[PDB]
């Protein structure tokens, strides 16, 4: 069985700047319920600071994969365990501010 | 028994709901220091069960210009949740910001 997953892009602060529509079946929100909000707004209070430090570090890691596990509040107000794997991308023909590409998968914590 | 007044503080928010200012009175009530609040959205703090409700209040605020939140919980700085009620007012200029008058219910 296919794990449920969706791709997102975020600025270095955590604000969703792009949301793949597979999010509906993964966490239940439409893309535009997520766009322009910070990912920490959907995160469990105990996991918020981990996730903010994860965004802070992924940009120091030379574009390698940083993984994080956290609880995300579905559109049912239920906590789902997410594994978000993330990495920076910066087009090397430019000097534009990097951004962060994430894949977001509902996983088991067990 | 605290005065209702000693349970009331103001905050100001950008239209994205991030804190831009908070009264120091919030420290005695909820534990936060106002400066660690700035740049964070209110949504970071609402109990999950009040979240969709606050989202609706926000929509009303953006449509009508002023709203009463009715009851919700804020994650305290040192664990647990404080109940509150807020009056929110949009200050438009010639939207510029949201003024929040916040009353702590749970003494
Ligand atoms: N938790 C929390 C919390 C603690 C505060 F001191 C202010 C605050 O911001 C609020 C609270 C309530 C509302 C709001 C805000 C806000 F400005 F961020 C507004 O969304 C509103 F529309 F007025 S509302 O009544 O939904 C949220």
Instruction: Provide, as residue numbers in chain B, all residues whose Cβ is less than 8 Å from the Cβ of A38.
Output: 41, 43-44
Q: How far apart are the C-alpha atoms of A87 and B66, rounded to whole Å?
A: 41
- Kindly state the DSSP code that residue B51 receives in the 8-state scheme: H
Q: How far apart are the C-alpha atoms of B52 and A98, rounded to whole Å?
A: 32
Listed by the residue before each break, gaps in chain B with C–N over 2.5 Å are 94
A45 and B75 within 8 Å at the Cβ level: the answer is: yes
Structure tokens given for A52: 């903010």
Q: How far apart are the C-alpha atoms of A80 and B63, rounded to whole Å?
A: 32
> How many domains is chain A partitioned into structurally?
1
* 3-state percent breakdown (helix, strand, coil) of chain B, nearest 5: 30, 35, 35
Domains and CATH numbers, chain B: 1-107 (3.30.450.20)
Domain that holds residue A108: 4-110
Structure tokens given for B102: 């916040």
- For A44, which residue in chain B has the nearest alpha carbon? B48
Radius of gyration of chain B (CA): 13
Q: A99-106 and A79-89: which strand pairing? A: antiparallel
Chain B interface disruption, residue of A45, A50, A76, most B CBs within 10 A:
A45
Residue A55: give its domain's CATH number.
3.30.450.20
Residue with tokens 């007044």: B5
Alpha-helical regions (H) of A18-97: 23-27, 31-34, 48-58
Residue with tokens 């950008």: B14
* 3-state percent breakdown (helix, strand, coil) of chain A, nearest 5: 25, 35, 40
A77 and B49 within 8 Å at the Cβ level: the answer is: yes
Radius of gyration of chain A (CA): 13
Alpha-helical regions (H) of B6-106: 25-30, 34-37, 51-64
Q: Provide CB contacts within 8 A for B84, sequence distance 6+.
A: B69, B71, B72, B73, B74, B102, B103, B104, B105, B106
A14-23, long-range: CB < 8 A, 24+ apart = A14/A38, A14/A39, A14/A40, A14/A51, A14/A52, A14/A55, A15/A39, A17/A99, A23/A104
Q: Provide CB contacts within 8 A for B72, sequence distance 6+.
A: B46, B47, B50, B53, B54, B83, B84, B85, B86
Method in brief: X-ray
């Amino acid at each position: 069985c296919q794990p449920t997953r969706f791709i997102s892009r975020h600025n270095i602060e955590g604000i969703f700047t792009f949301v793949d529509h597979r999010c509906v079946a993964t966490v239940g929100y439409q893309p535009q319920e997520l766009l322009g909000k910070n990912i920490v707004e959907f995160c469990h209070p105990e996991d918020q600071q981990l996730l903010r430090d994860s965004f802070q570090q992924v940009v120091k890691l030379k574009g390698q994969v940083l993984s994080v596990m956290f609880r995300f509040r579905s559109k049912n107000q239920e906590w789902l365990w997410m594994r978000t794997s993330s990495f920076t991308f910066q087009n090397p023909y430019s000097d534009e501010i990097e951004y962060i590409i994430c894949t977001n998968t509902n996983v088991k914590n067990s | 028994f605290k005065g209702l007044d000693s349970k009331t503080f103001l905050s100001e928010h950008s239209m994205d709901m991030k804190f831009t200012y908070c009264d120091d009175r919030i420290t005695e009530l909820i534990g936060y220091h106002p400066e660690e609040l700035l740049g964070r959205s209110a949504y970071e703090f609402y109990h999950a069960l009040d979240s969709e409700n606050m989202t609706k209040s926000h929509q009303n605020l953006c449509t009508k210009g002023q709203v009463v939140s009715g009851q919700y919980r804020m994650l305290a700085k040192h664990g647990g949740y404080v109940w509150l009620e807020t009056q929110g007012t949009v200050i438009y200029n010639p939207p510029q910001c949201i003024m929040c008058v916040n009353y702590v219910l749970s003494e």
